[PDB]
Design a binder for this molecule. Structure first.
Ligand SMILES: CC(C)S(=O)(=O)N[C@H]1Cc2ccc(-c3ccc(F)nc3)cc2C1
Ligand SMILES: N[C@@H](CCC(=O)O)C(=O)O
Ligand SMILES: N[C@@H](CCC(=O)O)C(=O)O
Lengths: 260, 255
């Protein structure tokens, strides 16, 4: 039986480098929610696997010109990986080229501010120009704003797409740093999951504000026609019903809380 | 061909319109799932007939005979082509039918009559004065039957042996039971239905504690159905276009 190649992404607390990683080899180098999730899926489906960090560090989007897929989605599409186990958002354009399991975690787009920033909603952001705001590149949040027909979000997109200097970031960490070092002059649009995690990390200077802008989920992805599709889906449902997914959420978000 | 849609009378998902007795076909009904069925059919390009599940149940497999009842049964035995309803995605069901990606989230929750001294599932388990139960033939009952979590397992032990029965045939009967029992009955039901009842007259019930689990409702089809993929894509499109949120706001929030 062949070793399953898992594509994932370095995104805290989903996949993180272990303290002693320089001593370690293979899967032992990593820890986090998706590392634990990969182990559980593999156990239930009965396969051996190798965790591999996506080469370009991206989630996945299709270039409007070339129509080529990048990120983890690209790795599945082009045969470079057998499965993605990551905070990968279930979307229509992605479901057209890969398969997703039932969602293992719920999330919505949300707003991160530096504490004390005079903003409490997306409407607030759209009605002013003093505080800049942006999203991650090559992900579902950027596509959300690009495609939205809702007035407030369309207004936000029109601003973001032409903002100078660029309001878009290559990694979540870059977005977080920009909030922290901009004296309240930058707000970051990101998924509630990542937002809530950062909010509980030192130096405890960020805050989630307003309601989630949408309601969606992360799913485990496989290339079309994969023999792993059905087993993985059943595994996710079993893990959900056994309470394992809730246990892993508490382990990596709330048991780790640093902000009291 | 006309697609046969099985559904269930459950407010505000599917309800009889006023003066429904002189109405016919799909026009008899209104609600979130009625609107959803219309949207799915438009995006998938099929004509349909809404039908209320014959036995009024969601779907459970008999332990003895292994026969499925409810909407699940109707799909399994070919009596309906698709189920569009607040039907919970579960492992045992996913083994016999297919579910779309979920169109709505929910968790098991507690309904009390206002003033009932109960804050949580643990409160219910550590007392005997206030009775409590679930819907029969649904995912909530199965949840307690299967749980290995101490609090929930203790609640199951009590409920399965309670006399008279604490289980209701319909959600409405569970709600009416809470309302008529002077605080001596609590009801375990999905957060979605709980939250709907909370905002209706006589405003005498409320949801207490956090949800016991996290799951979703999906559109269900019999295995091998040509509707499976189109329906899934329709749900995702409706999600991303904001239609699902609009429908939720229309039927819940529009005490
Ligand atoms: C594995 C089962 C528990 S699940 O398939 O029900 N997944 C959970 C996790 C999860 C995540 C997202 C959504 C959701 C809800 C509404 C919407 F529009 N889009 C997505 C539902 C659920 C239920
Ligand atoms: N989870 C997103 C990435 C994060 C974001 O776009 O905010 C995706 O799969 O594209
Ligand atoms: N949504 C449930 C019915 C309601 C309940 O069990 O509380 C099901 O599909 O079985």
């Amino acid at each position: 039986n062949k070793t399953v190649v898992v594509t994932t992404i370095l995104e805290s607390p989903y996949v993180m480098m272990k303290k002693n990683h320089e001593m370690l080899e293979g899967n032992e180098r990593y820890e986090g929610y998706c590392v634990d999730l990969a182990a559980e899926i593999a156990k239930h489906c009965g396969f051996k696997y190798k965790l591999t960090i996506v080469g370009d560090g991206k989630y996945g989007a299709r270039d409007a010109d070339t129509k080529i897929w990048n990120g983890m989605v690209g790795e599945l599409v082009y045969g470079k990986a057998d499965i993605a186990i990551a905070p990968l958002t279930i979307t229509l354009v992605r479901e057209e080229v890969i398969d997703f399991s039932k969602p293992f975690m719920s999330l919505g787009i949300s707003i991160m501010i530096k504490k004390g920033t005079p903003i409490e909603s997306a409407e607030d952001l759209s009605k002013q120009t003093e505080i800049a705001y942006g999203t991650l590149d090559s992900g579902s949040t950027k596509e959300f704003f690009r495609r939205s027909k809702i007035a407030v979000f369309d207004k936000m997109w029109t601003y973001m797409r032409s903002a100078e200097p660029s309001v878009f970031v290559r990694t979540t960490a870059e977005g977080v740093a920009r909030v922290r070092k901009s004296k309240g002059k930058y707000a970051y649009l990101l998924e509630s999951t990542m937002n809530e995690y950062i909010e509980q990390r030192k130096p405890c200077d960020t805050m989630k504000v307003g309601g989630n802008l949408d309601s969606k989920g992360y799913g485990i992805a496989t290339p079309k026609g994969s023999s792993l599709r059905t087993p993985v889906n059943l595994a996710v449902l079993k893990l959900s019903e056994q309470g394992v997914l809730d246990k892993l959420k508490n382990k990596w978000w709330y048991d780790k809380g640093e902000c009291g």
